[PDB]
Amino acid sequence: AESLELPKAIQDQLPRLQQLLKTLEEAPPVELQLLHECSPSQMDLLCAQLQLPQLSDLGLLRLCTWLLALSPDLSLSNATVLTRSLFLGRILSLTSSASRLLTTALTSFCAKYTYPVCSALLDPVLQAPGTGPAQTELLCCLVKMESLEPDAQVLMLGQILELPWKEETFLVLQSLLERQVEMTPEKFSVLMEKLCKTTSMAYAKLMLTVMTKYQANITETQRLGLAMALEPNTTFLRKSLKAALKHLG
């Protein structure tokens, strides 16, 4: 509609590429190597031109399969672009848990393009309404990844901390914090200030884990902000909370 120009060789090879994708449901081509010609904005259109959201789940991985072999790397922005064409609709579609395929596909794709998948997908899935069990699980897998190195884990941390927090955010956040992922006191304090703000079962776990693991980063100020948070008896396990709370006292 903007009349973005796709690169010459991609526009001209545009039926061959939709041909090779049909091939996939049934070693990657030089036609697949043409992605390296695109700017992301060209790419952005291109993905929309190829109708990657419509691949089978297998056909997605079998793309991801072929994509996973690609040297050079599809750049940060391009890999990001791709994934959210490919995966996002299926993700948002989900009424129940993913296929083994997707989770593998996701996680495998996330294995190489960890942060790009991570940079793309985390944020807008959560800010979607009716983000439920199906969705949060696969998000667990991003932040549970052996693959997720300290850099990516705090990219996750950096990325999670930008979001409107809610129950579903905490679930995923606990699972990142579970690893003993390290933080600036700044980053942690943002966790803390957000964290201090209460009646959900999930919330309690989040507080509790930090109170225990990053006792080593809990200041006076921050401990007192928990104290107020745990005031309520809405909270089950106030006692274990109080004990861990007290165990810093």
């Binding site: 129940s96 083994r100 069990p133 699980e137 089950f236 274990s240």
Partner: protein, 338 residues
Amino acid sequence: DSIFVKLLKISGIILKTGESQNQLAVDQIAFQKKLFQTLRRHPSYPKIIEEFVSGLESYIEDEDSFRNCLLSCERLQSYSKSLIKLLLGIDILQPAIIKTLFEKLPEYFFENKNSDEINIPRLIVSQLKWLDRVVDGKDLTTKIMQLISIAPENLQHDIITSLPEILGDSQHADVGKELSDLLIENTSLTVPILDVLSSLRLDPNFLLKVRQLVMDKLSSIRLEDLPVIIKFILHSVTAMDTLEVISELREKLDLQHCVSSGQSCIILLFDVIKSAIRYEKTISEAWIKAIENTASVSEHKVFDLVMLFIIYSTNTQTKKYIDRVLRNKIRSGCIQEQ
């Protein structure tokens, strides 16, 4: 000095520091009835319970005193039950002790393997197994459901597996409901749940509903469990649902998606099948009717060859039957090179 310790001393239990098993002056049933009638007769009758448990929790702020309170007791005149179990024998204290016990369990998520290789949480939930009578069997249910929903993975796995020793024979159905609700919620806990549900008391209708409910979720299972789940489906198959369930499985399974990693796990799969079908005849004829009856779609998958071969290798009554079927299939333009 505390109400708790003084009532315990008069009632006839020796409260030791917390390192070795608490000595006992009196018989346990005698002790129980003595403290029961003492607390019955004592003035401020509803408030002594509150005073009793506040003294208890103030005593168990230190770990080791509670650790000995949790452990099995010493008969002087030689090895007995735990004081918590015996104290939980009394109905008036019971829901309160439960509240406290469960309230303080989340302290021990992260401090794992301290001293004697003893998993405190396992021990505390082990305190509730095999109870004479629960003052509420529904309150305990709701409290363990909060607990089961929340715990980290290993602990969740542990307490869940500990469910049937805990529960009597009443509060089964609500657990069933809640667990199937957790099962659609989380894919990780199929296996131990399915194990549990074969051990509890349910309506057959509920089994069949959860069956269709797991199997819709059948692509959505990591490989390792995939074996044991089909194991379940085909020990749990009735004679009559045979061909539907087989048809559903036959549709839903792939032998394509999974793939040292893929092959070992698939191999185990086929073993599990070999067993099921070796040891139950009706799966075989029913299975072939479920490919033969799907003559229609030229598009039939890897599974179907692999499975005819297999059954020829096994029960040999079917060989002629397989061959006619495999010919009718080939001539029909389904079955081919690729």
